[PDB]
Short mmCIF file of C-alpha atoms and ligand atoms in Angstrom, two decimals:
data_model
loop_
_atom_site.label_atom_id
_atom_site.label_comp_id
_atom_site.label_asym_id
_atom_site.label_seq_id
_atom_site.Cartn_x
_atom_site.Cartn_y
_atom_site.Cartn_z
CA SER A 23 -33.94 -9.22 -6.66
CA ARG A 24 -30.28 -8.11 -6.31
CA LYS A 25 -29.50 -6.34 -3.03
CA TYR A 26 -27.84 -2.91 -3.95
CA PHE A 27 -24.44 -2.01 -3.29
CA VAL A 28 -23.20 1.78 -2.46
CA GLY A 29 -19.57 1.98 -1.72
CA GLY A 30 -17.46 4.88 -0.98
CA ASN A 31 -13.78 5.18 -2.13
CA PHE A 32 -11.71 7.65 -0.34
CA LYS A 33 -8.78 7.01 -2.55
CA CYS A 34 -5.60 8.49 -1.17
CA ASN A 35 -7.00 11.25 1.19
CA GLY A 36 -8.08 12.00 4.57
CA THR A 37 -6.72 13.20 7.98
CA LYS A 38 -7.43 12.30 11.60
CA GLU A 39 -9.60 15.53 11.96
CA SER A 40 -11.29 15.48 8.67
CA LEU A 41 -12.11 11.62 8.81
CA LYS A 42 -13.25 12.40 12.45
CA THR A 43 -15.89 15.04 11.30
CA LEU A 44 -17.00 12.49 8.28
CA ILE A 45 -17.61 9.69 10.34
CA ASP A 46 -19.74 11.71 12.84
CA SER A 47 -21.93 12.54 9.84
CA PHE A 48 -21.91 9.13 8.59
CA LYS A 49 -23.29 7.64 12.26
CA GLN A 50 -26.17 9.78 11.63
CA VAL A 51 -27.38 7.23 8.96
CA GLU A 52 -30.09 5.53 10.42
CA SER A 53 -31.04 2.48 7.99
CA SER A 54 -30.53 1.46 4.59
CA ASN A 55 -31.75 -1.70 2.21
CA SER A 56 -28.57 -1.64 0.43
CA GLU A 57 -24.96 -2.49 1.48
CA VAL A 58 -22.80 0.44 2.45
CA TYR A 59 -18.80 0.56 2.66
CA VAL A 60 -16.39 3.05 3.03
CA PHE A 61 -12.85 2.47 1.90
CA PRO A 62 -10.26 4.34 3.92
CA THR A 63 -6.59 4.16 3.04
CA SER A 64 -4.82 1.47 4.98
CA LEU A 65 -3.25 3.87 7.18
CA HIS A 66 -6.84 4.89 8.34
CA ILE A 67 -8.59 1.67 8.59
CA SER A 68 -8.31 1.21 12.35
CA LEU A 69 -8.96 4.94 13.06
CA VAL A 70 -12.10 4.89 11.32
CA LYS A 71 -13.54 1.79 13.03
CA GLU A 72 -12.80 3.55 16.20
CA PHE A 73 -14.43 6.69 14.97
CA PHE A 74 -17.45 4.48 14.12
CA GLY A 75 -17.20 2.78 17.53
CA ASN A 76 -20.45 0.64 18.75
CA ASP A 77 -22.72 3.96 19.08
CA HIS A 78 -24.18 3.32 15.57
CA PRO A 79 -26.89 1.72 13.36
CA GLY A 80 -24.83 -0.82 11.76
CA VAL A 81 -25.65 0.70 8.13
CA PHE A 82 -21.72 1.18 7.40
CA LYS A 83 -19.00 -1.53 6.80
CA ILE A 84 -15.44 -0.77 6.05
CA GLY A 85 -13.42 -2.18 3.06
CA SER A 86 -9.67 -1.97 1.99
CA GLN A 87 -8.64 -0.14 -1.57
CA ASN A 88 -6.65 -3.00 -2.51
CA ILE A 89 -4.90 -6.41 -1.16
CA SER A 90 -1.63 -8.21 -1.69
CA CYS A 91 -1.48 -10.83 -4.23
CA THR A 92 0.79 -12.97 -1.45
CA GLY A 93 0.03 -13.89 2.18
CA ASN A 94 2.19 -12.83 5.25
CA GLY A 95 5.84 -12.84 4.82
CA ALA A 96 8.35 -10.88 2.86
CA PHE A 97 6.57 -8.35 0.71
CA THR A 98 7.75 -4.71 2.12
CA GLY A 99 4.86 -2.08 1.71
CA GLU A 100 1.99 -4.58 1.12
CA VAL A 101 -1.15 -5.60 3.41
CA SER A 102 -2.49 -9.16 3.14
CA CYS A 103 -6.18 -10.41 3.37
CA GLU A 104 -5.28 -12.56 6.38
CA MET A 105 -4.34 -8.90 8.09
CA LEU A 106 -7.20 -7.28 6.81
CA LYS A 107 -9.32 -10.41 8.29
CA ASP A 108 -7.58 -9.93 12.10
CA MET A 109 -8.68 -6.23 11.60
CA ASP A 110 -12.44 -7.51 10.81
CA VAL A 111 -12.40 -6.13 7.21
CA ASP A 112 -14.39 -8.27 5.06
CA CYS A 113 -14.09 -6.52 1.69
CA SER A 114 -11.76 -5.05 -0.92
CA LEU A 115 -11.50 -3.18 -4.30
CA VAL A 116 -9.27 -4.98 -6.71
CA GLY A 117 -8.03 -3.65 -10.17
CA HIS A 118 -9.05 -0.02 -9.53
CA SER A 119 -8.44 1.92 -12.97
CA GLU A 120 -5.67 4.34 -10.91
CA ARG A 121 -3.92 0.81 -10.00
CA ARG A 122 -4.12 -0.61 -13.45
CA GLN A 123 -3.09 2.54 -14.94
CA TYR A 124 -0.03 3.93 -12.37
CA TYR A 125 1.00 0.56 -10.45
CA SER A 126 1.48 -1.73 -13.07
CA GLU A 127 -1.59 -3.91 -12.35
CA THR A 128 -2.08 -6.09 -15.30
CA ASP A 129 -5.22 -8.21 -16.15
CA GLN A 130 -3.35 -11.24 -14.90
CA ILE A 131 -2.32 -9.91 -11.41
CA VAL A 132 -5.73 -8.48 -10.99
CA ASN A 133 -7.05 -12.24 -11.76
CA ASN A 134 -4.58 -13.16 -8.63
CA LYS A 135 -5.91 -10.83 -6.41
CA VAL A 136 -9.60 -11.96 -7.06
CA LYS A 137 -8.63 -15.36 -6.66
CA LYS A 138 -6.59 -14.56 -3.41
CA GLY A 139 -9.55 -12.47 -1.82
CA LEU A 140 -12.34 -14.74 -2.43
CA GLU A 141 -10.07 -17.84 -1.20
CA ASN A 142 -9.90 -15.83 2.08
CA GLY A 143 -13.39 -15.15 2.32
CA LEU A 144 -13.47 -11.69 1.12
CA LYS A 145 -16.04 -9.73 -0.71
CA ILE A 146 -14.14 -8.65 -3.89
CA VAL A 147 -15.11 -5.39 -5.77
CA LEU A 148 -13.67 -6.06 -9.15
CA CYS A 149 -12.93 -2.77 -11.15
CA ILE A 150 -13.12 -2.75 -14.96
CA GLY A 151 -13.55 -0.12 -17.90
CA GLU A 152 -11.98 1.27 -21.07
CA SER A 153 -10.41 4.31 -21.80
CA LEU A 154 -11.34 7.39 -24.28
CA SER A 155 -9.40 5.87 -27.38
CA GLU A 156 -10.49 2.35 -26.57
CA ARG A 157 -14.08 3.72 -26.57
CA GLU A 158 -13.81 6.12 -29.55
CA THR A 159 -12.33 3.35 -31.93
CA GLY A 160 -15.33 1.06 -30.98
CA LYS A 161 -13.44 -1.61 -28.57
CA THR A 162 -15.60 -1.07 -25.52
CA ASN A 163 -16.65 -4.59 -25.60
CA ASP A 164 -13.45 -6.00 -26.71
CA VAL A 165 -12.24 -4.64 -23.81
CA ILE A 166 -14.83 -5.51 -21.14
CA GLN A 167 -14.82 -9.21 -22.87
CA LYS A 168 -10.82 -9.38 -22.20
CA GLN A 169 -11.11 -7.84 -18.77
CA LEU A 170 -13.75 -10.07 -17.41
CA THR A 171 -12.11 -13.13 -19.32
CA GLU A 172 -8.83 -12.58 -17.44
CA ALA A 173 -10.07 -11.31 -14.35
CA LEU A 174 -12.32 -14.21 -13.85
CA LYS A 175 -10.24 -16.81 -14.98
CA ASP A 176 -10.79 -20.20 -12.91
CA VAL A 177 -12.96 -18.26 -10.64
CA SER A 178 -15.96 -20.32 -10.10
CA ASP A 179 -18.36 -18.92 -7.56
CA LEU A 180 -19.28 -15.26 -8.08
CA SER A 181 -21.36 -15.01 -4.77
CA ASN A 182 -18.69 -12.96 -2.67
CA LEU A 183 -17.98 -10.96 -6.34
CA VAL A 184 -19.47 -7.34 -7.19
CA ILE A 185 -18.26 -5.71 -10.23
CA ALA A 186 -17.84 -1.96 -10.80
CA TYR A 187 -17.73 -0.30 -14.20
CA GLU A 188 -15.50 2.77 -14.50
CA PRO A 189 -16.09 4.76 -17.60
CA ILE A 190 -12.39 5.82 -17.62
CA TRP A 191 -13.17 7.35 -20.93
CA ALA A 192 -15.45 10.11 -19.01
CA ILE A 193 -13.12 10.69 -16.28
CA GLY A 194 -11.06 13.58 -16.57
CA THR A 195 -11.22 13.35 -20.21
CA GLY A 196 -13.84 16.54 -20.77
CA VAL A 197 -16.18 13.82 -22.24
CA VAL A 198 -19.30 12.82 -20.07
CA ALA A 199 -21.46 9.65 -19.72
CA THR A 200 -24.98 9.84 -19.78
CA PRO A 201 -26.87 7.32 -17.49
CA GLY A 202 -27.69 5.55 -20.88
CA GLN A 203 -24.28 5.01 -21.78
CA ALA A 204 -23.71 3.78 -18.35
CA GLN A 205 -26.81 1.66 -18.47
CA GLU A 206 -25.83 0.04 -21.98
CA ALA A 207 -22.37 -0.92 -20.54
CA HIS A 208 -23.97 -2.43 -17.34
CA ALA A 209 -26.26 -4.58 -19.60
CA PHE A 210 -23.28 -5.57 -21.74
CA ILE A 211 -21.36 -6.88 -18.77
CA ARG A 212 -24.23 -8.50 -17.68
CA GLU A 213 -24.56 -10.26 -20.91
CA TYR A 214 -21.22 -11.18 -21.33
CA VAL A 215 -21.23 -12.92 -17.62
CA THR A 216 -24.33 -14.53 -18.90
CA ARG A 217 -22.14 -16.14 -21.57
CA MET A 218 -18.93 -17.09 -19.34
CA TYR A 219 -21.26 -18.47 -16.69
CA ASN A 220 -24.84 -18.65 -17.17
CA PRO A 221 -28.10 -16.55 -16.70
CA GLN A 222 -28.85 -17.40 -12.74
CA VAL A 223 -25.28 -16.15 -11.91
CA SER A 224 -25.60 -12.69 -13.74
CA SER A 225 -29.01 -12.25 -12.60
CA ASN A 226 -27.40 -12.73 -8.95
CA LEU A 227 -24.38 -10.23 -9.89
CA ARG A 228 -24.34 -6.85 -8.51
CA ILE A 229 -22.87 -4.18 -11.22
CA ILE A 230 -22.00 -1.18 -9.52
CA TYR A 231 -21.49 2.08 -11.72
CA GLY A 232 -18.00 3.47 -10.94
CA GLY A 233 -18.20 6.81 -12.94
CA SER A 234 -18.99 10.31 -11.69
CA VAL A 235 -21.64 9.87 -9.06
CA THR A 236 -23.08 12.83 -6.88
CA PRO A 237 -26.34 13.70 -5.12
CA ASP A 238 -27.37 15.68 -8.38
CA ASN A 239 -27.44 12.62 -10.59
CA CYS A 240 -27.65 9.33 -8.39
CA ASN A 241 -31.20 9.00 -8.47
CA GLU A 242 -31.31 8.52 -12.27
CA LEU A 243 -28.71 6.41 -12.59
CA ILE A 244 -29.99 3.77 -9.96
CA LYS A 245 -32.96 3.35 -11.75
CA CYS A 246 -31.27 2.08 -14.70
CA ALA A 247 -31.97 -1.54 -15.11
CA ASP A 248 -28.56 -2.84 -14.96
CA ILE A 249 -26.97 -0.38 -12.63
CA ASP A 250 -27.20 -2.19 -8.80
CA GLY A 251 -25.24 0.88 -6.85
CA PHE A 252 -22.15 2.85 -6.92
CA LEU A 253 -18.58 3.19 -6.39
CA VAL A 254 -18.44 6.72 -5.60
CA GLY A 255 -15.26 8.72 -5.48
CA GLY A 256 -14.95 12.53 -4.19
CA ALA A 257 -18.58 12.65 -3.12
CA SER A 258 -17.74 9.79 -0.49
CA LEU A 259 -15.65 12.25 1.52
CA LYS A 260 -18.55 14.68 2.03
CA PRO A 261 -21.68 14.21 4.56
CA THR A 262 -23.55 14.32 1.38
CA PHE A 263 -22.62 10.60 0.36
CA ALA A 264 -25.95 9.99 2.41
CA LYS A 265 -27.87 11.37 -0.23
CA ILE A 266 -25.88 8.58 -2.89
CA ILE A 267 -26.91 5.99 0.05
CA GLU A 268 -30.67 7.21 0.05
CA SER A 269 -30.92 6.74 -3.78
CA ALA A 270 -30.49 3.36 -3.31
CA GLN A 271 -33.29 2.40 -0.98
CA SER B 23 30.83 10.78 14.75
CA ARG B 24 27.77 9.28 13.24
CA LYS B 25 24.60 8.17 15.23
CA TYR B 26 24.00 4.77 14.63
CA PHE B 27 20.41 3.82 13.28
CA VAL B 28 18.84 0.46 13.99
CA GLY B 29 15.31 -0.10 11.92
CA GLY B 30 13.09 -3.23 12.29
CA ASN B 31 11.07 -3.78 9.06
CA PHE B 32 8.07 -5.90 10.00
CA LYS B 33 7.45 -6.39 6.21
CA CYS B 34 3.83 -7.99 5.76
CA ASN B 35 3.38 -9.33 8.98
CA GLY B 36 1.55 -8.84 12.02
CA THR B 37 -1.72 -9.38 14.01
CA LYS B 38 -3.23 -6.93 16.73
CA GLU B 39 -2.39 -9.72 19.33
CA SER B 40 1.17 -10.28 18.23
CA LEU B 41 2.04 -6.97 17.69
CA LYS B 42 0.52 -5.89 21.49
CA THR B 43 2.53 -8.74 22.74
CA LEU B 44 5.62 -7.62 20.96
CA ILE B 45 5.45 -3.67 21.80
CA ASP B 46 4.91 -4.59 25.19
CA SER B 47 8.37 -5.85 25.09
CA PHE B 48 9.83 -3.03 23.36
CA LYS B 49 8.65 -0.61 25.94
CA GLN B 50 10.89 -2.29 28.44
CA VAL B 51 14.00 -1.20 26.51
CA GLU B 52 15.12 1.88 28.84
CA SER B 53 17.67 3.88 26.65
CA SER B 54 19.66 4.04 23.56
CA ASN B 55 22.52 5.99 22.03
CA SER B 56 21.16 4.86 18.47
CA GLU B 57 18.19 6.02 16.54
CA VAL B 58 15.31 3.27 16.63
CA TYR B 59 12.60 2.80 13.94
CA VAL B 60 10.34 0.04 13.67
CA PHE B 61 8.31 -0.21 10.23
CA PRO B 62 4.75 -1.70 10.79
CA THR B 63 2.29 -2.27 7.72
CA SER B 64 0.26 0.75 7.10
CA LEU B 65 -2.79 -1.04 8.50
CA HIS B 66 -0.85 -1.32 11.74
CA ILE B 67 0.86 1.94 12.37
CA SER B 68 -2.06 3.61 14.49
CA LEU B 69 -2.37 0.49 16.64
CA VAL B 70 1.47 0.54 16.91
CA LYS B 71 1.46 3.97 18.40
CA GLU B 72 -1.50 3.11 20.75
CA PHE B 73 0.40 0.10 21.91
CA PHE B 74 3.25 2.36 22.97
CA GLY B 75 1.36 4.72 24.38
CA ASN B 76 2.29 8.35 25.69
CA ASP B 77 4.74 7.40 28.48
CA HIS B 78 7.18 5.07 27.35
CA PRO B 79 11.20 5.67 27.28
CA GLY B 80 11.31 7.17 23.90
CA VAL B 81 13.48 4.85 22.34
CA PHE B 82 11.48 3.89 19.72
CA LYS B 83 9.93 5.74 16.59
CA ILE B 84 7.64 4.27 14.12
CA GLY B 85 8.33 4.46 10.40
CA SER B 86 6.52 3.59 7.29
CA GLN B 87 7.55 0.84 4.85
CA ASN B 88 6.77 2.71 1.55
CA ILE B 89 5.24 6.29 0.59
CA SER B 90 3.49 7.09 -2.46
CA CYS B 91 5.09 8.98 -5.17
CA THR B 92 2.35 11.57 -5.22
CA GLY B 93 0.31 13.69 -2.62
CA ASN B 94 -3.12 13.13 -2.06
CA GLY B 95 -5.78 12.82 -4.46
CA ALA B 96 -7.00 10.23 -7.00
CA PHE B 97 -4.40 7.42 -6.22
CA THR B 98 -6.35 4.42 -4.82
CA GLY B 99 -4.21 2.18 -2.68
CA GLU B 100 -1.63 4.80 -1.76
CA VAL B 101 -0.55 6.42 1.39
CA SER B 102 1.01 9.79 0.89
CA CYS B 103 3.62 11.66 3.07
CA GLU B 104 1.29 14.44 3.88
CA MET B 105 -0.91 11.60 5.50
CA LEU B 106 2.03 10.07 7.30
CA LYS B 107 2.94 13.41 8.79
CA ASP B 108 -0.67 13.78 9.95
CA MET B 109 -0.08 10.55 11.99
CA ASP B 110 3.06 11.86 13.49
CA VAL B 111 5.12 9.73 11.48
CA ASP B 112 8.61 11.19 10.21
CA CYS B 113 10.24 8.48 8.66
CA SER B 114 9.94 5.88 5.50
CA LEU B 115 11.69 3.03 3.53
CA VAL B 116 11.85 3.62 0.15
CA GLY B 117 13.06 1.29 -2.72
CA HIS B 118 13.15 -1.59 -0.79
CA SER B 119 14.34 -4.78 -2.75
CA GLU B 120 11.00 -6.63 -2.38
CA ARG B 121 9.35 -3.59 -4.02
CA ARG B 122 11.97 -3.21 -6.72
CA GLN B 123 11.64 -6.86 -7.33
CA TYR B 124 7.88 -7.45 -6.95
CA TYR B 125 6.14 -4.18 -7.55
CA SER B 126 7.92 -2.68 -10.85
CA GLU B 127 9.70 -0.03 -8.61
CA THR B 128 12.55 1.30 -10.77
CA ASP B 129 15.53 3.50 -9.88
CA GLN B 130 13.38 6.60 -11.32
CA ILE B 131 10.45 5.70 -9.40
CA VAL B 132 12.94 5.22 -6.11
CA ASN B 133 14.38 9.21 -7.25
CA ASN B 134 10.72 10.15 -7.23
CA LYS B 135 10.04 8.85 -3.99
CA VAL B 136 13.27 9.91 -2.30
CA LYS B 137 12.47 13.55 -3.26
CA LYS B 138 9.18 13.48 -2.45
CA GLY B 139 9.84 12.22 1.22
CA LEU B 140 12.67 14.64 1.65
CA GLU B 141 10.62 17.52 0.51
CA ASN B 142 8.03 16.81 3.02
CA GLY B 143 10.23 16.68 5.87
CA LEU B 144 10.67 12.75 6.34
CA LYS B 145 13.92 10.66 7.05
CA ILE B 146 14.38 8.58 4.02
CA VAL B 147 16.11 5.04 4.36
CA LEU B 148 17.37 4.35 0.75
CA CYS B 149 17.58 0.69 -0.19
CA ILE B 150 20.12 -0.25 -2.74
CA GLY B 151 21.86 -3.64 -3.37
CA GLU B 152 22.75 -6.16 -5.93
CA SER B 153 21.53 -9.44 -7.22
CA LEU B 154 23.23 -12.54 -7.35
CA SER B 155 23.83 -12.81 -10.83
CA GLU B 156 25.20 -9.24 -10.81
CA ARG B 157 27.59 -9.98 -7.98
CA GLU B 158 29.01 -13.19 -9.56
CA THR B 159 29.52 -11.33 -13.11
CA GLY B 160 31.46 -8.83 -11.47
CA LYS B 161 28.84 -6.06 -11.59
CA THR B 162 28.40 -4.98 -7.56
CA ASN B 163 30.15 -1.86 -8.25
CA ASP B 164 28.46 -1.03 -11.65
CA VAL B 165 25.33 -1.64 -9.86
CA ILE B 166 25.88 0.35 -6.85
CA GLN B 167 26.66 3.60 -8.84
CA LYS B 168 23.83 3.27 -11.13
CA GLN B 169 21.82 3.23 -8.09
CA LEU B 170 23.17 6.00 -6.44
CA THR B 171 23.50 8.28 -9.17
CA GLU B 172 19.55 7.45 -10.12
CA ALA B 173 18.27 7.39 -6.74
CA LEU B 174 19.83 10.65 -5.47
CA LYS B 175 19.35 12.67 -9.04
CA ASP B 176 19.10 16.42 -8.00
CA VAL B 177 18.99 15.26 -4.30
CA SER B 178 21.25 18.09 -2.84
CA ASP B 179 20.87 17.40 0.91
CA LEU B 180 21.47 14.01 2.54
CA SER B 181 20.86 15.51 6.27
CA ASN B 182 17.58 13.23 6.44
CA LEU B 183 18.78 10.35 4.41
CA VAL B 184 20.08 7.19 5.38
CA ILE B 185 21.31 4.29 3.02
CA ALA B 186 20.54 0.58 3.42
CA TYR B 187 22.82 -2.01 1.79
CA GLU B 188 20.78 -5.11 0.96
CA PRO B 189 22.77 -7.75 -0.13
CA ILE B 190 19.93 -9.47 -2.41
CA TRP B 191 22.69 -12.04 -3.69
CA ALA B 192 22.82 -13.32 -0.01
CA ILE B 193 19.56 -13.65 0.70
CA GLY B 194 17.17 -16.65 -0.28
CA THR B 195 19.93 -17.83 -2.41
CA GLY B 196 21.73 -20.39 -0.23
CA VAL B 197 24.87 -17.87 -0.62
CA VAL B 198 25.96 -16.27 2.70
CA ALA B 199 27.63 -12.73 3.31
CA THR B 200 30.57 -12.56 5.73
CA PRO B 201 30.95 -9.25 7.98
CA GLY B 202 34.03 -8.31 5.40
CA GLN B 203 32.17 -8.48 2.55
CA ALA B 204 29.05 -6.41 4.20
CA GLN B 205 32.19 -3.97 5.12
CA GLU B 206 33.44 -3.89 1.53
CA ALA B 207 30.33 -2.77 0.25
CA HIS B 208 29.66 -0.10 2.85
CA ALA B 209 33.01 1.21 2.10
CA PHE B 210 32.45 1.15 -1.72
CA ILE B 211 29.10 3.17 -1.09
CA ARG B 212 30.80 5.60 0.85
CA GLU B 213 33.64 6.23 -1.47
CA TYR B 214 30.90 6.66 -4.27
CA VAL B 215 28.91 9.33 -2.16
CA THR B 216 32.49 11.07 -1.92
CA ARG B 217 32.47 11.42 -5.47
CA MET B 218 28.82 12.33 -5.87
CA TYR B 219 29.02 14.56 -3.12
CA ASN B 220 32.26 15.30 -1.09
CA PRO B 221 33.90 13.81 2.16
CA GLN B 222 32.06 16.18 4.53
CA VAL B 223 28.93 14.77 3.27
CA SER B 224 29.91 10.86 2.96
CA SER B 225 31.33 11.13 6.70
CA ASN B 226 28.41 12.00 8.08
CA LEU B 227 26.13 9.39 6.22
CA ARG B 228 24.63 6.60 7.86
CA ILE B 229 25.08 3.51 6.09
CA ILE B 230 23.04 0.71 7.58
CA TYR B 231 23.33 -2.93 7.01
CA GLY B 232 20.26 -4.53 5.64
CA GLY B 233 21.33 -8.40 5.29
CA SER B 234 20.52 -10.95 7.59
CA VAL B 235 20.88 -9.52 11.12
CA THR B 236 20.34 -11.73 14.45
CA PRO B 237 21.21 -11.31 17.95
CA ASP B 238 24.07 -13.86 17.11
CA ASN B 239 25.94 -11.48 14.61
CA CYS B 240 25.06 -8.01 15.14
CA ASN B 241 27.84 -7.50 17.62
CA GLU B 242 30.25 -8.40 15.31
CA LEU B 243 28.80 -6.30 12.01
CA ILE B 244 28.65 -2.95 13.96
CA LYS B 245 32.11 -2.80 14.83
CA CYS B 246 32.77 -2.64 10.84
CA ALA B 247 34.25 0.66 10.37
CA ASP B 248 31.49 1.62 7.56
CA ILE B 249 28.37 -0.45 9.09
CA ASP B 250 26.56 2.52 11.11
CA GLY B 251 23.36 0.15 11.82
CA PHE B 252 20.96 -2.39 10.59
CA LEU B 253 17.73 -2.54 8.87
CA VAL B 254 16.56 -6.01 10.48
CA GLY B 255 14.19 -8.21 8.93
CA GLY B 256 12.39 -11.13 10.75
CA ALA B 257 14.56 -10.66 14.15
CA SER B 258 12.65 -7.56 14.46
CA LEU B 259 9.29 -9.15 14.91
CA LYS B 260 11.16 -10.77 18.31
CA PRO B 261 11.89 -9.38 21.85
CA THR B 262 15.26 -10.04 21.07
CA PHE B 263 15.30 -7.35 18.77
CA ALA B 264 16.50 -5.62 21.89
CA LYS B 265 19.74 -7.50 21.92
CA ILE B 266 20.34 -5.68 18.16
CA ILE B 267 19.73 -2.69 19.67
CA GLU B 268 21.98 -2.98 22.20
CA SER B 269 24.82 -4.23 19.89
CA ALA B 270 24.85 -0.43 18.77
CA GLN B 271 25.09 1.21 21.85
NA1 NA C 301 -30.93 -0.59 -11.03
NA1 NA C 302 30.44 0.80 12.71
#
């Protein structure tokens, strides 16, 4: 059976003081049957590693929120896979909705980043999802197919991939996603991955839910047959992120 | 008379070990009449601060290679001015040629970033410059005017601004800029700032040269009347960056 994956995307948040307090809480988490990652900002990755230190259970690992399309060189403002590996970071998000929406990350850029990450041995959390206009006009499945076809173009091996479904339509719009709707989207993603690859590959692929996750709804969502964990937003900046990890046990 | 400014842009380069060695050299620099900044990647800022420690000569300060357009929040992959201030970083590059060229930073995004940086108390190194096609078609001045007009739109106070002129036409093209050509571009920039503001403001504004700078040419360039220091690329990842600082004495 698939090992569950619980990620905490800090986004553009954190201070030295707030992260010190938060990581002190996370060090109290004694064990997990799931993979557990937190994704601080690039500015905070080394600090967060220092805060964890060695006096912890080895439940939490650290990931990046983004990776450069290129390796080292004349890429002002960018951070490369090789730099991350030097820092002992073995995972990154790619194609988060916010980067697609705000920073001109196209499907083709996302493909480039997935390939770059996987080639450098990183675990890549590929983010996909449709907007409210797309959902309301019946294009959910068209969008998921396009995003997968393009993001995974010439990507042969999914062993180090995880897919996060972001119900963009249900984030900040006043519209709310039910667990049933989440499950339906995850089942469809898995079904398309079967077509693009095969049933063995799709059966092994973790598909994590990247909508609104809190301590109040995580236990219901994780039971859904095609939901294999979470990519958590704001709830990952609170000690009760531990309750979300516990739901995945 | 203007205080000179020597910046070292590391771009997307560095490892823990290589930076440890480099900063150990930079700590040997005993004094400078110039402002001195190094701009590591965001991943490396806290480690570079560690390596300098708390008993060095106080010659070097640390800057960022980029800042977010927005403050904290749901901006995956971005690092904000407020985050930089929390880490005691007081300076950033904005509008570097590589970000304009590769990451879709328009003049309007650059304006947004200059305003956001300055409003948060950061010293902003605004980068401008024209391409080889622009230079060869006679558009150098048109391009500089446009870039300044847009980047400084509604920017009233230039006390925390520095401008870096990047002769993009002379970087990676096989075409080489002479110090005379650099001087001519710097003089034009200052002349246009006079028109946009006034001669007091333009006489106080540092305009630093962001073309090819090494220990072999820095002494000739710094003597130029309108060249007030440097934004150095690859030469800033070597101990001999110290020789470039020394040219600005
Ligand atoms: Na499940
Ligand atoms: Na000069």
